[PDB]
């Protein structure tokens, strides 16, 4: 069954389109004959247009509001099968030339949406007396139903396709479904066909790039949630449209919105904040630097020569972790933070400087730069830092500008416990607390390879021994909430699916 979404384009794309997952947007010559069911609304804007096999209009989308059958300004338009418009209101307006349609009622083709049924310009339906309205009401809708209410796998009608994953009482866990079927359009599919992906809902779609990302866990591409900002290859300063750009001014800015993996080498320069007259760019607003907070990888060198004076650290690069030196400044340096006014270095994420060296000079008020052990950051043995001309180490120690004692001697990007390459005790995600909340604390987390991992929220804290041995409801040792078998769960499974989608009562 061909599936689709100027006129000639849709004319040659709807030539077959037995079932349309989008909308019958026939706008502005008899190219369609077998459009059985449309999963959406029908933007039909014309005299001789069969539309004979159009049976169902699901109204997944609308022109303005509940506009299922939108028309305007078609006597020979026999939509004789258009006898049930599901979840939509017929917008059958401005029909001056349409004939034989006035005699037939326009409401039985709709169900429970007569409030939004306005119409203005026993009984036969369309052109020619050979066709009839074929009343059936005054679960099949348009006329083992031929067309189902929600989902028709092969011949049967179902409100929901068999889920791709099914609870298994044998393993005391919610498992995958051996008979798992992806709900593609109105038909369940053992495997998602037409090279489509596995959407969060289970409804196969060919574009899941909005608020999500594409991931291949099995033989079929599957769309998963965009963990923070997901991957977005983006051109850097010197490669691409910015080939001859000299910095991230107020022109190439925004072009870096949600740009995660910069494919070039960023050129933060004083000319960016001052603005450049020759290149016709206005001064860069310091608040616009938060656009660069999305960067997590630079396959080049991150050169920073100017920062807003109201900012005491590199907050715009707090998510920058990689500075892979495919292109290097002066052939030696990848991170080139030079002559800034940063009190703390601020690169609390920076963990992998692969190729180039590091020069951190002119930071008259940055002390923690020398404290870091940069042998861990370097990815090769030919790299050596050039941290000189910073704030005096002796004066820094005397003034107390030394980071927390709750940090490993490995170093630190700043005074806050968030900014520390390694911490003396265990670490709570971004930060590193004095100790995990093993016995005292609200999060009541647990130690995992020297890292605080908060226990599953549906397990109650234990005030005698450790709150939970491992992450997840199973490993929690105390559970005031209900428990499913030997594991913890939110509530007992009641409305679940079994061998034939049976409601497993389970236990009380």
């Amino acid at each position, epitope marked *: 069954k061909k599936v689709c979404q100027h006129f000639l384009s849709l004319q040659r794309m709807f030539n077959n389109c037995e079932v349309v997952l989008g909308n019958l947007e026939i706008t502005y010559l008899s190219f369609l004959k077998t459009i059985q069911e449309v999963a959406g609304y029908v933007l039909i804007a014309l005299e001789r247009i069969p539309l004979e096999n159009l049976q169902i209009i699901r109204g997944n989308m609308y022109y303005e509001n509940s506009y299922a059958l939108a028309v305007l300004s078609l006597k020979e338009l026999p939509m004789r099968n258009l006898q049930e418009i599901l979840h939509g209101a017929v917008r059958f307006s401005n029909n001056p030339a349409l004939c034989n349609v006035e005699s037939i009622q326009w409401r039985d083709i709709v169900s429970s949406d007569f409030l939004s049924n306005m119409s203005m310009d026993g009984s036969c339906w369309g052109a020619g007396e050979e066709n009839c309205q074929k009343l059936t009401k005054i679960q099949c809708a348009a006329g083992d139903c031929l067309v189902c209410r929600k989902f028709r796998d092969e011949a049967t009608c179902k409100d929901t396709c068999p889920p791709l994953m099914l609870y298994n009482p044998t393993t005391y866990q919610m498992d995958v479904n051996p008979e798992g079927k992806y709900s593609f359009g109105a038909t369940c599919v053992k495997k998602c066909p037409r090279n489509y992906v596995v959407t969060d809902h289970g409804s196969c779609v060919r574009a899941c790039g909005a608020d999500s990302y594409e991931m291949e866990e099995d033989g079929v591409r599957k769309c998963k949630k965009c963990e923070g900002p997901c991957r977005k290859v983006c051109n850097g300063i010197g490669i691409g449209e910015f080939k*001859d750009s*000299l910095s991230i001014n107020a022109t190439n800015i925004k072009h870096f919105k949600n740009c995660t993996s910069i494919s070039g080498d960023l050129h933060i320069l004083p*000319v960016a904040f001052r603005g450049d*007259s020759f290149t016709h760019t206005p001064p860069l607003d310091p608040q616009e630097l938060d656009i660069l907070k999305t960067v997590k990888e630079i396959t080049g060198f991150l050169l920073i020569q100017a920062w807003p004076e109201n900012r005491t650290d590199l907050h715009a690069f707090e998510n920058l972790e990689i500075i892979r030196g495919r292109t290097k400044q002066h052939g030696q340096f990848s991170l080139a933070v030079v*002559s800034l006014n940063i009190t703390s270095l601020g690169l609390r994420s920076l963990k992998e400087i692969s190729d180039g060296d590091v020069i951190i000079s002119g930071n008259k008020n940055l002390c923690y730069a020398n404290t870091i052990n940069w042998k861990k950051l370097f990815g090769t043995s030919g790299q050596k830092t050039k941290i000189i001309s910073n704030r005096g180490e002796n004066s820094c120690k005397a003034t107390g500008q030394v980071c927390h004692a709750l940090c490993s001697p490995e170093g630190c990007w700043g005074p806050e416990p968030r900014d520390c390459v390694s911490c003396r005790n265990v670490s709570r995600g971004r930060e590193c607390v004095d100790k995990c909340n093993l016995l005292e604390g609200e999060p009541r987390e647990f130690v995992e390879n020297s890292e605080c991992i908060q226990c599953h929220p549906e397990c109650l804290p234990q005030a005698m021994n450790i709150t939970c041995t491992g992450r997840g409801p199973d490993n929690c040792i105390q559970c005031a909430h209900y428990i499913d078998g030997p594991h913890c769960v939110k509530t007992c499974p009641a409305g679940v699916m079994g061998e034939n989608n049976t409601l497993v009562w389970k236990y009380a």
Partner: single-chain antibody
Amino acid sequence: DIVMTQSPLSLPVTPGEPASISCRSSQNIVHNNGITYLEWYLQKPGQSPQLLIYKVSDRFSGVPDRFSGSGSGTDFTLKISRVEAEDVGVYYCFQGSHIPPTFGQGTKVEIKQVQLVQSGAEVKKPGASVKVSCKASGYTFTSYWMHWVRQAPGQGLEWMGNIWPGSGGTNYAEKFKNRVTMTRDTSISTAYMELSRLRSDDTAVYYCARSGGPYFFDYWGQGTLVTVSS
């Protein structure tokens, strides 16, 4: 280029009078970003040009409020409510919105720290090459475009190109695309200008102006006159 025609030419003004110089552009001085790059550069007789109205109607720091400017579309003008001996000189209605900057004809008004040190004046022969140096001190050299403006005698200022000391990128003008070479020595902070294939009409004063933030040629060099004849 853009013909920056000026309504008055060599206009003489008596002191204490509202002088007005109107300059019109062949094309609309309006850029995509929406800011009109129109500037009025004071060039005192035998002196490096200095900016006055950094915009169509703004004012350069250190320039008194006596100078004013107003205009829209293609028609612009400059207003000088009070004129003194200082206001004497040549005013160049400059445009930056168009890719090649172009100065006006030159309305010579008459009567009816950072410093860029240039080289010395030299006299060469046609077909030779003249390197023109411009030492830069007082600012971060690899942070400002090193523009290379020229002023042919008996003619308005003609742009010839620039160079970015940070990366060495140069943008020669179309008339000088295949004739000139703009280099620089970062270690010792000068930018040179090797103009090869000198010609009879190539005599000019090659100012090494420095592009500012929202205005062009914020600073300038003294000017290296290069007279060439056979």
